[PDB]
Amino acid sequence: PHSPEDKKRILTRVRRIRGQVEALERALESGEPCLAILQQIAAVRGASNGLMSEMVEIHLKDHLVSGETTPDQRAVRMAEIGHLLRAYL
Amino acid sequence: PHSPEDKKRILTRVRRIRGQVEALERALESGEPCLAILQQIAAVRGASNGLMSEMVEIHLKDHLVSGETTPDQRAVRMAEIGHLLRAYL
Amino acid sequence: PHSPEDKKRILTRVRRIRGQVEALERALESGEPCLAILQQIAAVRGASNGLMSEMVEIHLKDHLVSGETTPDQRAVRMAEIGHLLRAY
Amino acid sequence: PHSPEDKKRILTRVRRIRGQVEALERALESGEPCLAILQQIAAVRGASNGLMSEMVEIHLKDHLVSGETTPDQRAVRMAEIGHLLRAY
């Protein structure tokens, strides 16, 4: 995220997830039911996906859309993400 | 896909999928075992995913990287597919 | 799918997919815009997933839930399906 | 997870996720480049997915396969998980 507001809202998502992952680690140590564990992991998966989507859009918008850039510059930028994107599906 | 070669290899992938979807429809009519159908379905999901990844990459290369475009042009192009990408994950 | 009710609803999904894929093949043959093509491929991927889901739930219910089975019988049936679930 | 080995290996996955998320939280606080962050976020998505996968397989084996259960018991257990599978 380039702009402060983007940085801000991504950090907010990450701290939420950290909290979920901490709650999940507690439940494993404390021997909480298998069902609950499965549910918590599903919540973490959903939130990680959601974070990935927002972050992909921010990155593309910041590096491929904005700025009086050249196609050569944007090609390098696209290549850096290409591996990430293939994996995303 | 803009270039003829890109159009060609996507059409090639789609025809492959058509073949699978045709075979699967056959297996359903023919009362073939459930496991096989589940498998054939899994292969179609797999090829559909792979087709998506590749097309996303081609589209991003053709509309966001290539061409002496303005940031305004790229924003319209990015918005046209923003929804697809969110949906893609 | 075992039951007629589950068998109709799966075929209906496939024929729907068939149609989308033929339309997609048509748009590629006719040289239509990238955007249109991207959008249909995305609709086909989505329909592929929905179908995978409906079919997984059917298979689990038919082979793991229904029937007075032994854990051994269910272990075999589960194993043939497990790798698929991992990929999904 | 029921067995100690399935319990250890899931905890090990969660702790590694914990680590990645704290590392990610760190890069954001410190103002590191966009690309690094996208990459770390992508590794966490990947790890979340793998964990979901492993846990689904563990849950299905422990509650649908193992144990002299009735189809009625398995139906209740299956329904509790069905939604999760669809979204997955």
**Domain boundaries, given as residue ranges, for chain B:** 1-89
CA distance linking residue A48 with residue A29, whole number of Å: 23
Q: Which option is the CATH number for D1-88: 3.40.50.720, 3.30.1130.10, 1.20.58.1000, 1.10.10.10?
A: 1.20.58.1000
CA distance linking residue A58 with residue A50, whole number of Å: 13
The three-point CA angle A75-A78-A83 to 5° equals: 135
CA distance B67 to chain C (A): 15
The three-point CA angle C44-B43-C4 to 5° equals: 80
Minimum Cα–Cα distance from A66: chain B residue: B71
Q: In chain B, what is the straight-line distance between the N-terminal and C-terminal CA atoms, in Å?
A: 22
**D63 Cα distance to chain centroid:** 17
Write the burial class of residue D57 (CB in 10 Å: 0-12 exposed, 13-18 middle, 19+ buried).
middle
CA distance linking residue B43 with residue C85, whole number of Å: 12
Phi and psi at residue D61, to the nearest 5°: -70, -40
CA distance linking residue D84 with residue D82, whole number of Å: 5
Residues C2, C5, C10, C12, CA torsion sign = positive
Among residues D62, B67, D22, C18, the alpha carbon closest in space to that of A37 is found at D62
Query: With left for phi above 0 and alpha for psi between -120 and 50, is residue A31 left, alpha or beta?
Result: left
Q: In chain C, what is the straight-line distance between the N-terminal and C-terminal CA atoms, in Å?
A: 19
Q: Work out how many CB contacts closer than 8 A connect A with B.
A: 60
- Amino acid type, D57: E
Among residues C38, C40, C48, C45, the alpha carbon closest in space to that of C24 is found at C40
- Return all residues near D58 (Cβ < 8 A) that are at least 6 apart: A34, D1, D2, D6, D10
D74 touches chain C (CB under 8 A): yes
Q: How many CA atoms lie within 13 A of A56 on its CB side?
A: 29
Residues D23, D26, D28, D33, CA torsion sign = negative
What are the tokens at B87? 């949906």
D43 touches chain A (CB under 8 A): no
Q: E strands within C1-88?
A: none
Q: Are C10 and C44 in contact (CB under 8 A)?
A: no
Indicate the helix (H) or strand (E) that contains A45: helix A34-60
B27 touches chain C (CB under 8 A): no
Longest dimension (CA), chain C: 56
Q: What is the resolution of this structure in A?
A: 2.2
CA distance linking residue A46 with residue D34, whole number of Å: 22
CATH fold for domain A1-89: Methane Monooxygenase Hydroxylase; Chain G, domain 1 (1.20.58)
CA distance linking residue C36 with residue C24, whole number of Å: 9
CB contact under 8 A, A49 and D48: yes
Residue with structure tokens 């292969």? B43
- Amino acid type, A40: Q
What are the tokens at A86? 């293939």
Residues B56, B62, B65, B69, CA torsion sign = negative
CA distance C69 to chain B (A): 18
Q: Which of D53, D60, D85 sits opposite C57 (nearest CB)?
A: D85
Strand, coil or helix: B68: coil
Method: X-ray
- Return all residues near A61 (Cβ < 8 A) that are at least 6 apart: B75, B78
CA distance linking residue C51 with residue B42, whole number of Å: 9
CB contact under 8 A, D14 and A21: yes
* Number of CB atoms found within 10 A of residue B18's CB: 16
Minimum Cα–Cα distance from C51: chain D residue: D86
